[PDB]
Amino acid sequence: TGIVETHFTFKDLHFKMFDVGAQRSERKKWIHCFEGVTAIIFCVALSDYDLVLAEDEEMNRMHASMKLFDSICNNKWFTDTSIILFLNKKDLFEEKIKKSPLTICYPEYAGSNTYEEAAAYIQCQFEDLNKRKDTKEIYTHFTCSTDTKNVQFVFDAVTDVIIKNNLKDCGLF
Amino acid sequence: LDQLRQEAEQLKNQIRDARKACADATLSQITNNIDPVGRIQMRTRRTLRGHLAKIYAMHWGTDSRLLVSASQDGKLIIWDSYTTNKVHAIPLRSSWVMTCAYAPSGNYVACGGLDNICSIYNLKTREGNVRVSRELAGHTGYLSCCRFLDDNQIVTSSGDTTCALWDIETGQQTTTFTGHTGDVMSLSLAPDTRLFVSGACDASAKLWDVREGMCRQTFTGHESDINAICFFPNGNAFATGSDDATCRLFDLRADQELMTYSHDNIICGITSVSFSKSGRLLLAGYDDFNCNVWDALKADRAGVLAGHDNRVSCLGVTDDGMAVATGSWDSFLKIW
Amino acid sequence: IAQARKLVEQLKMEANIDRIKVSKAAADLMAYCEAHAKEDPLLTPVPASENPFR
Amino acid sequence: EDKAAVERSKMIDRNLREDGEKAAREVKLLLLGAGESGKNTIVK
Amino acid sequence: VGPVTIACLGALATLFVLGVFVRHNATPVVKASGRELCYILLGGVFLCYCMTFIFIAKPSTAVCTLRRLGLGTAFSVCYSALLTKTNRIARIFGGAREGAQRPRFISPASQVAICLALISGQLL
């Protein structure tokens, strides 16, 4: 159906969560309509890295996620909006890292058998371009899906982006 | 099969070659002579205030003396030029609305948005305001445009590349057509309810009949998506609104391309195209605040006007050329 | 197969009418668009005397 | 009857003015990601 | 001799500060002041430093008139410049938590309007 809006006033602020709505149409047509948003949420699964359901035999889900992230960051409409890094891997990724050598993410792997170095590598590799980093801050959080949906981190991020936009247009930075 | 596609596309090449051969004389005739035009063609009317949102599209499809526009804050706008005020301000359930329409009788107002819901509002009511709007669905793609010539049949588009014809009384999917590769962006109401036009990539100005239903008119040559389309005041003509800033007149009977006024003076695309009267003044929006109006008959720019500090999105012209309505995201509505 | 046949069928029948759709199109091109091309361009310039706006 | 139109023009502006900062104060977000990328995993 | 030399030293110091800030408006610390109320405060300080010349002068109808309103205006300018910056910073940092929207009357020009209104109250 259409886009689903979830309005919840938790953390003393009227949060509104807007989904993609499964448009399955031209990207820009619904990208430019959402202009004026304060912050966006970027969700990528980490424990399902072995899944190759994105393409039959051409690419994997990692390539699609990286391409979509690059398109979002390089887009001229959202060059100033901050971005949020979320995931849904609390312990499944850690359990899978025991058997998976973490070599599919990068062919030139130079890490151990754990996943801390893999997380560091992916989080430092996400920001391929640094021009938008100065204009818009990038927030990254790991071990998501807490009790109250990680209310503390999202509240801190939203208040930080709000104050940043407030001081940007008043000639204070 | 492969053989069927091959024979079909040799047939298409033969057909387009024949059309070019037959229309070369017409192209030479139209390009040989031009008519004189004015210098500015401008007369200011007023300024509109009382808005704090963005706008996408409007619809000047009524013989009365009012204007209608839609905003993303959730409220519709029905303004008068002289009064610079609104008769009523009804709210909109949808968060975003991109479709705006009005009735010649001033009784029904059509709006819709990303929720795949086409809502018809009651402009005239006993209480003076509409209590609620009826819900219509049946699509998997985002709503793009909707038009109607009466209170019996309504045409609408979707992001799933299909044109839906519905009836107010029935309230169900009455007519549905198979779609092309690209998504339909806009539809133009026919002067006498003959056919409606859909525009997308590789399907520039594809005409579909309302009664018979089959496709007869299809043109190719505009790779970029076409944003806005409108019928000529004289009738039996098309409009080109490709995102590649390509502006070229088209004919229904000719089924062939015409002269193009592309130039290096601009580097961005266009968002809307509109005729003043029989192509006397081509009005087209651009990605910048600055705007220009061309003269198709004179093959030159009629004038330059911006009236905004941000990219303009909506543009409408009265059928009799009484007034033109335009607007950008700066919540400014100016009649040029 | 079946889907491609419908696309071929639509293109096959469209060319049939389009082949005979000329019907001396140039006569219409130079006879249709001048009917209303002289009213509005002269009507729009008003010296703030009969214009309904302002 | 022109006075009534002006009076009506005053109350529509006030009605639209109230909805201005009321909707602006409400923060809007944007959720976008890969297909089935834990849409229901996060508490909503 | 004492007052005039100390006034000259203060005027030179504030002129040097003005030249530094007007030419080094790239580091965010000087931008965090506001870059309008800072100039207003510098003008007030310059008026305070140069008012002693009016103070030590031959009495006259013009001299007496100037030294009557200046004694309040010079300090009111600085006080308003200090007040508006703190007020805008506090309002911006307070209204972010509740009602996420642009605070009213905050701008490089609007704050100047408020500061000049506060000064004009004392002038009136």
Author numbering:
A (entry chain A): 182 to 354
B (entry chain B): 4 to 339
C (entry chain C): 9 to 62
D (entry chain A): 8 to 51
E (entry chain 2): 569 to 692
Recite the paper's sentences.
The metabotropic glutamate receptors (mGlus) play critical roles in modulating synaptic transmission and neuronal excitability, and dimerization is mandatory for these receptors to exert their functions. In addition to homodimers, these class C G protein-coupled receptors (GPCRs) were shown to form heterodimers as well. Here we report twelve cryo-electron microscopy (cryo-EM) structures of the mGlu2–mGlu3 and mGlu2–mGlu4 heterodimers in different conformational states, including inactive, intermediate inactive, intermediate active and fully active conformations. The Venus flytrap domains undergo a sequential conformational change, while the transmembrane domains exhibit a substantial rearrangement from an inactive, symmetric dimer with diverse dimerization patterns to an active, asymmetric dimer in a conserved dimerization mode.
To fully activate the heterodimer, the mGlu2–mGlu3 protein was co-purified with the heterotrimeric Gi1 protein in the presence of glutamate, JNJ-40411813, and CaCl2, resulting in a map of the Gi1-bound mGlu2–mGlu3 heterodimer at 3.3 Å resolution. Indeed, the mGlu2 subunit, of which helix VI mediates heterodimerization in the G protein-free mGlu2–mGlu3 structure, couples to the Gi1 protein in the Gi1-bound mGlu2–mGlu3 structure through a similar interaction pattern to those in the Gi-bound mGlu homodimers. Compared to the G protein-free mGlu2–mGlu3, the mGlu2 TMD in the Gi1-bound structure shifts towards the mGlu3 subunit, generating more extensive interactions between helix VI of mGlu2 and helices I, VI, and VII of mGlu3. The results showed that the heterodimer activated the Gi protein at a wild-type level, when the F765S substitution that blocks G protein binding was introduced in the third intracellular loop (ICL3) of the mGlu3 subunit (mGlu2–mGlu3X); however, a considerable reduction of Gi activation was observed if mGlu2 carried the corresponding mutation (mGlu2X–mGlu3). The highly conserved class C GPCR residue W6.50 (superscript refers to a modified form of the Ballesteros-Weinstein numbering system for class C GPCRs), which displays a rotamer conformational change when comparing the inactive and active structures of mGlu2, has been suggested as a ‘micro-switch’ that is the key to mGlu activation. This was also observed in the Gi1-bound mGlu2–mGlu3 structure, where the W6.50 residues in the Gi1-bound mGlu2 and G protein-free mGlu3 adopt different rotamer conformations. In the mGlu3 subunit, side chain of the acidic residue D7445.47 forms a hydrogen bond with the side-chain nitrogen of W7826.50, potentially stabilizing the bulky residue in the inactive state. However, in mGlu2, this residue is replaced by N7355.47, which is a weaker hydrogen acceptor compared to the negatively charged aspartate residue in mGlu3. Thus, the corresponding hydrogen bond in mGlu2 is weaker and less effective in constraining the rotamer conformational change of W6.50.
